[PDB]
Amino acid sequence: QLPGLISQPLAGGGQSWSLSVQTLVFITSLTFLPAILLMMTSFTRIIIVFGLLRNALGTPSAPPNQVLLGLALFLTFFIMSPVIDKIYVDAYQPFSEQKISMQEALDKGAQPLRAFMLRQTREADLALFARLANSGPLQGPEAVPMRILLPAYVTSELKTAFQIGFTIFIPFLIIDLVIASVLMALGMMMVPPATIALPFKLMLFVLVDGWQLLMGSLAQSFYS
Amino acid sequence: QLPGLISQPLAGGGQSWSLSVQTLVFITSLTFLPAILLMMTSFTRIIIVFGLLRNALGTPSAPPNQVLLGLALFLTFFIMSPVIDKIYVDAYQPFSEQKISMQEALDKGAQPLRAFMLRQTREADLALFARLANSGPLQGPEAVPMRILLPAYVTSELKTAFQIGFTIFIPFLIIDLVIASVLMALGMMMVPPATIALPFKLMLFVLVDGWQLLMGSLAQSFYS
Amino acid sequence: QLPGLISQPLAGGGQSWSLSVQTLVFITSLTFLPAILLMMTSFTRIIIVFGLLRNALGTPSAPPNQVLLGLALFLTFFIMSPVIDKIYVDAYQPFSEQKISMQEALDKGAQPLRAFMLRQTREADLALFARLANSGPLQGPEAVPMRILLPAYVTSELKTAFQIGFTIFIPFLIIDLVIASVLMALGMMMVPPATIALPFKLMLFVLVDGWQLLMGSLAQSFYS
Amino acid sequence: QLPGLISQPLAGGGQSWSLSVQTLVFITSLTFLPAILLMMTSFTRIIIVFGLLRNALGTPSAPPNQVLLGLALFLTFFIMSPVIDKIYVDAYQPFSEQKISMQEALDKGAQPLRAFMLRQTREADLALFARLANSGPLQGPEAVPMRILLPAYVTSELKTAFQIGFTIFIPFLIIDLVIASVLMALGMMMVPPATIALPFKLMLFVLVDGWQLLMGSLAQSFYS
Amino acid sequence: WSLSVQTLVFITSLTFLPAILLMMTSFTRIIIVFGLLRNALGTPSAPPNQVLLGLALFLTFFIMSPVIDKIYVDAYQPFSEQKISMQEALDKGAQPLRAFMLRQTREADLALFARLANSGPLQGPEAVPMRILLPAYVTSELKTAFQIGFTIFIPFLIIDLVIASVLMALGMMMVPPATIALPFKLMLFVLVDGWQLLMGSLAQSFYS
Amino acid sequence: MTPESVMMMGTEAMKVALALAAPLLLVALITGLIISILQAATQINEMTLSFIPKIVAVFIAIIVAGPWMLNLLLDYVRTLFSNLPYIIG
Amino acid sequence: MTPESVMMMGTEAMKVALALAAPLLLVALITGLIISILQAATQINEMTLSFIPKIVAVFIAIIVAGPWMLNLLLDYVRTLFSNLPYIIG
Amino acid sequence: MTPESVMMMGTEAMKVALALAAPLLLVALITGLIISILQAATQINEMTLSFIPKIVAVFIAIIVAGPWMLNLLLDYVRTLFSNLPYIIG
Amino acid sequence: MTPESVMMMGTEAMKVALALAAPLLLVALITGLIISILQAATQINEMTLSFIPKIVAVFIAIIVAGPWMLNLLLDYVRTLFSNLPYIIG
Amino acid sequence: MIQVTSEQWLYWLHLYFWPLLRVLALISTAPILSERAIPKRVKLGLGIMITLVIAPSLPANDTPLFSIAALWLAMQQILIGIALGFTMQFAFAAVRTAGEFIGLQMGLSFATFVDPGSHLNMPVLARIMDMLAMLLFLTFNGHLWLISLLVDTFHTLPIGSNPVNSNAFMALARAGGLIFLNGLMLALPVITLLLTLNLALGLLNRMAPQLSIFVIGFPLTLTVGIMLMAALMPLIAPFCEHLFSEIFNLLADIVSEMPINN
């Protein structure tokens, strides 16, 4: 009597030890659960910011993808520590001792996440997806289904990550333009400006201590 | 019910424990099953359009394949909430605790999918595959088989996805050509136009607020 | 049905657990049987042609490997409905209710596959492997063994797939060369021609109805 | 026949698994022997040569890994069919109906494999491993232990596969170098030579009838 | 009745056991060196993992043959016909393995695991239990396998760098150096018949 | 998806692109011509002498005719993304 | 799939590519040549002066010769995809 | 597989590659040098004026000496693949 | 396996890499300088004029200095394999 | 013969599971422990060898591994292992960044500058420097120190329901800035020398526009860069000693700071 296995007698004492349909869904989608879980968190914005920073430094794939995937994970774990804490003290703390029921526990585990997503989603995206869904007034946050909130959240995170990335490009774009113009004004047409500009970009990024500023901005602008 | 492990007595009280041929088929499908099940959904067109957009931005793999994978899944879940609910109430609910057999449980879960893919399939693809299969009139939805409906639907989705992607490349192509022309007219020949054009492309994409425009356009075009 | 584990009670509440050679060959063949079945189901030619098309588009992994793989299976399933249902009515139907043993069911279901692979295989490959095998007088098609039929069929499918891919490569190569020459003539010698050729490639591919023509060709050129 | 397991419950909710050493080594070997049997056969050279060819085509993973694995299996089955049927008539036939012992059937099933390896094993590898093992004269083929035959055979197969692959790369390297030099002469430092080389590589590989030649060479390289 | 499924789960779990025996053999070093070589050729998964695993198993069987013979004559043959107890035959099956481990195990790993195992002073090497010797041996094998792999891994990257520099100096910025370096790397590896030298070096350095 | 629709869409795109680049390219060309003419009087063989005035002229044109180009691009992209559901037939 | 047939397909493709790129390349060449001649006669020279007339000429040529080139490409690709099942072998 | 065999095979491969590339590179260099001499005699400072003549010359060279290079390369590959099961032992 | 041993191994590796690439790189540099000076003496000037001579010079250098570089590589690899057991601690 | 009853088979599975999971979390992301050359079977085997010593003298927090408690405990275990391993990834990321920045100035990967499309990077020099860093890591027994630090994490914070403090995670994410800083500090001499060489090439372009970067600069710049990297190697040894040591101190401080705020 395994949780995933269902047994039914057939014919002459034959028991069909078969796999439950829920277990089938899980075993089909196990390679997808990391994707959805990472999209419901702040991963979607940190990763785009990090990638756009890589492109801004004029040095694609300069830090390996794995180290930045780990770094973005740390920011998600720190940023949503209040969310998980709420989940712990509202869902697991009253349930670990079988003090409250299963059905309400998923709602209690989703309400902090629902509010957290709502605090980031633009009103325009929610209105657009509600109009496409032909839903009702949705005056209250509880009235907003996951069907509308999930795509609106990601389409807002993409926009804000792109905006932050563009703000990141702006200084490096100025650096590249200045270096190229200085080279061209001195009759150095053949010399590619990227080779000269790359060390200057890295030095200016390090001297202004840009990584600390990026962490501060990503931590600050996200909850507000 | 489901396919699983069977135990059949043999001879003098000897019991034989072995898997079922349907279980072997189930495992062999699992290797590619997720893909075939997900292409009957909206995943194909959305993921192709997103990949084409990522190539259009001049910055391949700036959003990683995992983020695009999660985003296509979220948009598909938003689009096919009614189909998923119909499958749930018609196939999943009456079969989770076995009020119905597996053979017609797939038929119940396929009829909404069949009708939907009929809605989203061009008549030209259906006629092409009917002629190739040398089938009959296929006047009714009941007449057209899955064998003809699946590849025609896939071809229609691929054609629509490339149409959308080609329309997407146009503003970014304009941006690239304009910036390259300006850089050449300034004598800035050795400067790579991609480095100067990526931040401008992102700035245009965030001022136009294209992300929600893309989601709305995809939803409206795919509901038709 | 399939070989598995056997159990005979012994003494007071004792369960023996043994297996035969069929079980140990079957468990090892589990890993390789999907590959062999894909080899005999012409998945190779379709997947290779589609990968070559993906390379010809100049945008690697614009449709992910999963969607390309799934559409290849869908096209093969459309192609081999007669083979599949012939196997069903000749092998799976008389074996599901254990009317025939597996040893004859395998060769009964492989007869339509044998006739198929004989139809698609070129005569040159068959002659080459017949003289490599140093066989005697081989006249009748039934006298052709599977050991000769399989690799010759694989070679014929590989050659046809490569020919089809080579022919597909031509218009995209023309577009790439034309745009590269135009860019060089205008002097924009730092602009990557791919970023301008990809939108034009997709414009051509959606204006010629590339998917319809490609699917129709892959179907019609196949029963021949 | 094969060894097994005995299980008797102990008190409430208990079970005991009695096991010998033969059954334990048999259970442990089940996850390894599918690879071992492919190491005694011609799989290594064929699969390595085909992977090297896949890299040579300039389009890695254009035929999926399962495609190469299945076609390599088919080629090995064609090559090893006499050994396979000799094993069948000498080992599997007299042991399927328990007419002869397992410890001696294993000896019978290895004699054709040992002869095959000695046919394809170079004397240099045998001398190297005999020196490393401080063995005796080993003048006769029967005097050669399996511990000497296996690694020497594997080393010879690896060396032969690498030789064949290196010979295969040369025409494709010539095509790539010529196309790159022509493009550089014309300018076009932005044009990737791969997009031109790949269609020309397919042109060559289908005009020279490359697949038949490669298969024939691989098959004839084993009888020698 | 669930006991008949518990035994099947036990068998499934037992299928994972041979990892322990491969740790006790040369597998952990040989497979790592061969994976490093696969990364060296610039063509990942050119020989499939099955091929690499099988050839590693064959090399280990060649290397570990005297140890297997000692175990056979000491543990398997008096226990196959039930002439000796299992609890003490298991001990008999480790002493050759003990002497085989202690030769290839570095002092630093043993010291670290003794410090973190809260074990007292030991008067003799035979007093070292398996629970502390096995992880130290595995770590030492990891270290030496990576050292061997990186020592062999140099000339291929030297070829890569040389070819990339030459192609770039020829103005061929869009030509990928890997596709030209792979045939040259294989040409060198065949010319210096590096398979034989690699096999011999692994065998001798693991014997010593 | 008729070829005439593709040609009309490409014509609109090319018109928008010309509207974008006409001021910048025109002012760059005019400034370059003026400096080339002035170089005849001075007999200066400083090859890239026209680069700085070209840059300042392009910057002036961008900071003067910038919002117009931005509005044109925003309107055109908005129309494209709005009629995306309609182009598919 | 004889080498003669491959050469025939290659020369057909080369003719299609030449007719596809002849207007743009010839117009760009003529514009560059005439602008360079004018610069030589005026004894003033800016290398990037000719880029704008070249771009304008190519832009005009694409408008004038666009439909014909597009029709050529569409017809040739349709012929290829129709003959594919007959040229497999 | 002795290093002498590798050297002779490599030199033969380089001979094939040179035969493939000698006409195209030669005609490209010749037409580029001729256009350069024209650029030097008459005070024409156009940069990409030689590109179109080089493309035309390479096109003509491929059209004329096409089947010869194709046959040479095919014969070389046939010989290599026929000697494959013999050069390895 | 002392850190100094790894450091010496890295220095030897880079020395071998330099000895492999110095001939070809220096030959390419020399021929590029020669072509550039010849162009400077005359009035001919384009980017691609020196590429073909650079290719030819590198090809000739590879032919001439091929066996020596191959012997260096083979000796280095053989010494590495021979000293592999000695470097293990 | 061999006898294995139910209690022993299960107790072993349940008792080892949580230290097993933490150790595998460390292994699957770690400087050398996480390499595709190492097969996953070896990855699990090393983890369970480490668990063989972790499990004794460790509190028995044996909860069912098919409940939500299992998910919560697994989350904390994976968090600890991932934190340790990815924090130690910083030294090798820094040396790879320095090597690739040196290579880009040399001109090895110029296709990346002109277009991001295509996998034409192949930072070979960065790979060589990463090898040297890993070999120095081996000679300094860095993996042993990682294992000891993991044991210390087991001791300080046991397997339990106490949430892990997130200020440490933010601090070690903020410490991610060491990559670029150490990349500069390792690559200042070659970067400055190649910048001066490129400026000299531009000055040569001044007198003759016919001199081009492709024609002249790239061969000479590549040769000079190869010579400099041959000369820069002896600087690597003390730099790696400092680099690993500072990261180890940072990890020790962060681990000591985690369990106060559960």
Numbering used by the authors:
A (entry chain E), B (entry chain D), C (entry chain C), D (entry chain B): 22 to 245
E (entry chain A): 38 to 245
F (entry chain J), G (entry chain I), H (entry chain H), I (entry chain G): 1 to 89
J (entry chain F): 1 to 262
Article sentences:
The FliPQR complex forms a channel for export of flagellar structural subunits. It also acts as a template for FliE assembly within the Membrane-supramembrane-ring. Five FliP subunits and one FliR subunit assemble into a right-handed helical structure with a narrow central pore. Four FliQ subunits peripherally associate on the outside of the FliP5–FliR1 complex.
To address this issue, we conducted cryoelectron microscopy (cryoEM) structural analysis of the purified Salmonella FliPQR complex reconstituted in a peptidisc, which is a sheet of short amphipathic bihelical peptides, and obtained the structure of the completely closed form at 3.0 Å resolution. After iterative 3D refinement with C1 symmetry, the 3D image of the FliPQR complex was reconstructed at 3.0 Å resolution from 109,333 particles (EMDB ID: EMD-61993). In agreement with previous reports, the FliPQR complex adopts a right-handed helical structure composed of 5 FliP subunits, 4 FliQ subunits, and 1 FliR subunit. The densities corresponding to residues 22 to 41 of four mature FliP subunits, FliP2, FliP3, FliP4, and FliP5, and residues 1 to 5 of FliR are clearly visible, enabling us to build the atomic model of these N-terminal regions. The N-terminal region of the four FliP subunits whose N termini are resolved forms a β-hairpin with β-strands β1 and β2. The N-terminal region of FliR contains a single β-strand (β1). These β-strands form a β-sheet at the tip of the FliPQR complex, which we named the β-cap. A total of six tryptophan residues, five Trp-38 of FliP and Trp-9 of FliR, stabilize the β-cap structure via hydrophobic contacts with each other. Furthermore, the N-terminal α-helix (α1) of FliP1 projects toward the export channel, and its N-terminal region, including Trp-38, inserts into the cavity of the β-cap, thereby maintaining the closed state of the periplasmic gate. The β-cap has a narrow pore between FliP5 and FliR that is wide enough to allow the passage of a single α-helix (Left).
